[PDB]
């Protein structure tokens, strides 16, 4: 029972290190973004920088896009 106590407190150390290490990281989002539009031409077009505003740097990663 005391070496089970030893392994259990080692496990709890790593558990707390895990949770308050993952609390201070940032993970890349992966969500199905959906945009609702009007009749058919707004859907046929490219969504023309409606929130990208550059098609090179600030389009395809969404953790912070920008408006210059």
């Amino acid at each position: 029972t005391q070496d089970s106590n030893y392994v259990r407190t080692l496990r709890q150390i790593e558990l707390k290190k895990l949770e308050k290490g993952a609390k201070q990281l940032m993970f890349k989002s992966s969500g199905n973004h959906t945009i609702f539009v009007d009749s058919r031409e707004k859907m046929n077009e490219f969504t023309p920088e409606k929130f990208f505003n550059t098609t090179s740097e600030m389009v395809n990663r969404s953790e912070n896009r920008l408006t210059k």
Binding site: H33, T34, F36, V37, T47, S62
Partner: peptide, 8 residues
């Protein structure tokens, strides 16, 4: 549209 999806 790439990562997106344009629903009516």
């Amino acid at each position: 549209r790439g990562k997106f999806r344009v629903q009516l």
